[PDB]
Amino acid sequence: MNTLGRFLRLTTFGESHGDVIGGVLDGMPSGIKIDYALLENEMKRRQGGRNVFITPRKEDDKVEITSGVFEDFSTGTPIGFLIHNQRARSKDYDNIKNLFRPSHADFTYFHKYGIRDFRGGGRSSARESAIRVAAGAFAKMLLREIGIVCESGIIEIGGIKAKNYDFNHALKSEIFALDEEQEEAQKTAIQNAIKNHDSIGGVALIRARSIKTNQKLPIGLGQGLYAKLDAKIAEAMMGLNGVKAVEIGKGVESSLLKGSEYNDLMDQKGFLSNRSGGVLGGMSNGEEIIVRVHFKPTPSIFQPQRTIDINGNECECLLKGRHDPCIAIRGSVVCESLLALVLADMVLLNLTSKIEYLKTIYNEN
Amino acid sequence: MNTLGRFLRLTTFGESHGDVIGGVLDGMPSGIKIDYALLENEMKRRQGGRNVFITPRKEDDKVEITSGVFEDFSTGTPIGFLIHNQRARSKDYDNIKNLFRPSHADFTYFHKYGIRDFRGGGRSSARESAIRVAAGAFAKMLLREIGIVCESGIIEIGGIKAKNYDFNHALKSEIFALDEEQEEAQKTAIQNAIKNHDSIGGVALIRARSIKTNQKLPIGLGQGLYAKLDAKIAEAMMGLNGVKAVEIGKGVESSLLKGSEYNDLMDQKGFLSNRSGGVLGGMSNGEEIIVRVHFKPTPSIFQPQRTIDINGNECECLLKGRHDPCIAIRGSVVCESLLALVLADMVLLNLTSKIEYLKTIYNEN
Amino acid sequence: MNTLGRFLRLTTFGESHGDVIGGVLDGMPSGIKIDYALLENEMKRRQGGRNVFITPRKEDDKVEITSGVFEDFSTGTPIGFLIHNQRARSKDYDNIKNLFRPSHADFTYFHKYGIRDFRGGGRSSARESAIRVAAGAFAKMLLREIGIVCESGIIEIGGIKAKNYDFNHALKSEIFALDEEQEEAQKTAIQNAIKNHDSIGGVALIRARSIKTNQKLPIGLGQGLYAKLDAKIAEAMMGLNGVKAVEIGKGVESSLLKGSEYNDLMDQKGFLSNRSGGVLGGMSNGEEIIVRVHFKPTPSIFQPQRTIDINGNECECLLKGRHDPCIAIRGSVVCESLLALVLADMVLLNLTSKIEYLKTIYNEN
Amino acid sequence: MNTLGRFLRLTTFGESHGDVIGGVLDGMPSGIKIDYALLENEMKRRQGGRNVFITPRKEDDKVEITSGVFEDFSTGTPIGFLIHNQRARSKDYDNIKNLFRPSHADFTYFHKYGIRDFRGGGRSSARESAIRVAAGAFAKMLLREIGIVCESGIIEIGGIKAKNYDFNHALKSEIFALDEEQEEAQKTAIQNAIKNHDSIGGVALIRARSIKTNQKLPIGLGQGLYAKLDAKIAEAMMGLNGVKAVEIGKGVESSLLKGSEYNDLMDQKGFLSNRSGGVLGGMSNGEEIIVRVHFKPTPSIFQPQRTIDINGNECECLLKGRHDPCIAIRGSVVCESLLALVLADMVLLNLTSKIEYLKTIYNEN
């Protein structure tokens, strides 16, 4: 299944080893101003966005919109887009690429499809993230039209947890750290990983909120029993390579509380304590949507790992070269994009809820 | 969305306060013997978790299969079923019917649809769970045809964690406890909650394994990038009311490991470890599928509560009659049913993976 | 696939030979008053309502709504319903339940699923049509809210065609004849069929229009390239048992015209002609939607027919008893219901087309 | 909706005015040899059958496969492809491009999305058709693996009907004529159209048949009640620009016949006739699948037509230059491609029909 979403549907060209990757976003309402600045910046953030960098022009990826846009506005038809990349021949980063690399999908792909494909280029992921982030930017454009914003950051790296949260600080942080007081410790954990040719796990925090201060998000986003808002958020997040757990609000701490301790209350607007994480009974309750995504440490490490080959014979896996020491960092940005895509889809699906909605659109126009 | 699944599709009649709830399971291959005993037992286990400790009643819900079955075998057409329940004459065990109880979707439903609905009967959920378990039994029947089995149990209640897991023991446990050494402490936690008219959270462990002792599950279950096995398991589980987090394999503990520690190595025939939880790259890798589901404490408890009504005014929540002290217990069984439904859907979808599959079915027959 | 529709989704219990058939319609907006009189009348019309009848009460099938309705208004959740058919004794009408009846689904079901299972009792159709007409009544309630009405009638029987169309006259006609001038000839063809223990084909005309005189239907109903309005109308109609052809507007006669003769010109108020049949570019153009559905003659006829049994041996098929001499008559009503369902689905899907629809509903209502 | 299909899913970039169009075919089983010659010839045929042509690798066409293929074999992942066109310097044909061309989608797109975009390049048409024909080539590759072939030809042009059908002859005919004895007269109709700056309609005949030694197609293709084979063929064909009617088998002639005249009898050797057109009860019965598609005359004609502009001001539409005099000709090839896509999808969906299928792939593995 290469499509994400129900009304707002993102479909991808899938995994490939070519110089061009593509995707198409179907379901965008017409009349949405295309924010090229946003699209470009999203693509920049996807690349870790550290301290020093060169003009992305002659550097990396560029998003080419092939359809769905006219004079800088969405037309309402499918928005197709391509992303070109790859330059300069590499080395190897792997000897006989005929074995199953630990924690990689090589093993499952081989058995499900039987074809000995697999090649370099950051393998499975990486490419897809580009498509997801590009698509996420359009979803963000849609959400802004109704005052909704999505943000994220890193709350934990190698077990070093953030105590306070500053999303603005995460933005200009080399590791998107939300706690400047824990940032250095987190960075040191990363440096040690690179030093020992290893990798560490991390936890990303994603949030959705109304742009207006103390203004609540729409109440009721989520569709029926099998398309609940938290269920779809979990689906998108868990579907991200490297993700092994997803929490909503209080999450795993919820199982440790008593009703008297937990149990939220109301008044006339939106709840106070956000233990629900913005989702109650499968639907948005108006509070900020809080999501925690747990990433396992990066699979590829410059160390000798025992494994087997396509024939089944025991062999050694030694992946030379530099590798991402913590995928949670780049993963946080992708999770942010996915939340935008899910939320935008729900905003559109919700338009069908009350007959008054139909009357206002059809009988008053 | 009242349908779960892609090929094996479960559709529900949705929330209903009448005497009958219906559902239909579409996509069952023909020729599967209908295990009435299994279905009956599953429905029995569903109740286990409230007023049914060693000597559980049975004078409840009767399942009527209205189609899709002929001579005790699936015909290949939709299996429609009706579940008849309820009895006696409602007295108390509740309060006003013009208020959205504390931490209830009743609030969200009003904003989404704007209708003064709702009543008693455990608000809902419990009803849909009957549909899920019934459908789950059929899914289990299909899975058995290819040697797959799904099991579950309680690994944690009120922060009291199980150390060793015995699914055999959980079956005959009043609280489905997987660890007999921690069972008494877990029960006491519930006892105190009941005595205090409170409630506590819990964690269910669900797993799938190949029936044949020392056998592997099919490798490659999971579809494309947007219908990965872990993503779909997460979608189903998080969609259960009360669930705030879902873990696969090492789960939330994965973000605290290093690559050298996490990576599952391979020997001669199989992986040396299963931190992946049976899912690698979004596809089953043959090892046991491990899922952890976290339930927050039950909202409605005898203890007086507060929140809001339908007009954002004031009201009382003195809900007479006892209330479920731990939804995780009955929730574990539903999670087991959902895993069966997801896996069975995936088993059907995987038949399309290799051309040799089509040739075998069309040309070698 | 037991579900019809994208958002307004009708799911059926499928084929069965029990005393109860069910279905569920999801996607209905909340706040729609349930017109019970309309529902009852639709069920009455489905029976081909001919000369002389009695109170539909104790006579035949009655629709039981089990969910989705509160205080005579849709709740926005799934509307599940059950229909009860025969009960008091029976008669005969059968033969050798081991052979494939010519022009019946017997052969294909046998090969696709294998399981024999084939008796009498209207085999299929009759039941499913009931589910479609009941569901269609709800769709008609939705359409009425935005001023749209669907109607139908018989324009041909045995090649005897109508010249003028009077839908009011069709409602009171024993054969739903649209042209009273050809009605007697059409009725005679039917009488000859009965006399000769044979059947005859027919053609139904289905139309959708605005209830307010000459006002245009919404323009733009239909979705993207692969869910066009004429495409979905064709899918729904051709899917009806006995249908061999579907035409939109000028239909088959379109291929006989020159561009100058076919092209519908326009003036400020709208189109000057409607050869397009209300659908242009796969979307409603505001004019009346015109559909023609061609039915093959009824399969069951009381005449010896050469066929084979499940063992492959030649045998005689002789279906004793009376049979529907012209399925197009009852079919016309089902087609009317199907058009209502497709259009209502399209009315809901169209809500996401323009950003101003979202802004109006979220930033202002 | 920019996706066609349930499992073998074709998603398109949608309408665009750029020099690049794209699509992705998801669901292809792995291990299918990519027939580049087939793909290339298919792209050739979609442009017509002129006796005088220029060698490929130039002018147009050329499908760039970006993913889903490895060493000329399908990988089982999505097959994304791109099609390029347009260069420098052209003819002309353009004047006041802000009005609604009669019989074109201009009017509905404007009302549905409110954005004017209808530019040149034939508006699109050929654009989408290139995506469908390309995708159809892959579908044909799949189908060939189990002995299924799809063929097509023109049976009527401007009212001139073919009496005999020779598909081999259609392949080499300039207008894909199935009856060489009527071809000259059919060409004359087109000639007269061009001369008069007009256009004419036509009818395409599409057929699917088995090349297997039993000469029979698989029996049982088609899914449940709402995804029947004839329903999906009708959906695909009617969704094609210019199509106003679709017939299966005896089609519109079916309604003029009596049951005794229509019913397809059987004997030891199988069906004695095929008025059903190879689809019975919504499923393939093994006989050849017969489809007739009726096209309205080409919308664009070099003649004065009264219409209005996007603002409502009445004006004259005069489309200068030459135009396709009969879109039915190129349309026939697209119809062939669409039948292949639908059949291939059905071939995959049918794999879940019998439990014996699952057992053979999972237990005998």
Ligand SMILES: Cc1cc2nc3c(=O)[nH]c(=O)nc-3n(C[C@H](O)[C@H](O)[C@H](O)COP(=O)(O)O)c2cc1C
């Ligand atoms: C008496 C009672 C029984 C419940 N039964 C179940 C159950 O069997 N399974 C489950 O997952 N949740 C169950 N719930 C949870 C409700 O479906 C619902 O989640 C809750 O009332 C609202 O809290 P939440 O929407 O924040 O989860 C139950 C709750 C109560 C109060």
Ligand SMILES: Cc1cc2nc3c(=O)[nH]c(=O)nc-3n(C[C@H](O)[C@H](O)[C@H](O)COP(=O)(O)O)c2cc1C
């Ligand atoms: C060098 C390298 C780069 C990676 N890039 C990303 C990335 O950008 N985003 C992401 O979410 N995961 C990324 N991953 C994670 C892998 O896609 C994933 O861990 C692996 O293929 C399968 O993990 P799973 O079995 O848990 O699904 C990367 C892994 C490696 C080794």
Ligand SMILES: Cc1cc2nc3c(=O)[nH]c(=O)nc-3n(C[C@H](O)[C@H](O)[C@H](O)COP(=O)(O)O)c2cc1C
């Ligand atoms: C006695 C009789 C009654 C029928 N009733 C209906 C009906 O009410 N509506 C309908 O659309 N088809 C009706 N049919 C049509 C059959 O369901 C259908 O022809 C058959 O199962 C499959 O043929 P098909 O390939 O044309 O669908 C009826 C057929 C017979 C023989």
Ligand SMILES: Cc1cc2nc3c(=O)[nH]c(=O)nc-3n(C[C@H](O)[C@H](O)[C@H](O)COP(=O)(O)O)c2cc1C
């Ligand atoms: C110059 C011209 C070329 C066309 N080319 C094709 C073609 O190659 N294949 C096709 O199926 N339709 C083709 N069409 C049909 C149009 O896409 C279509 O008839 C019309 O613009 C939209 O109205 P309709 O979709 O309701 O028929 C063509 C039309 C014109 C005017």
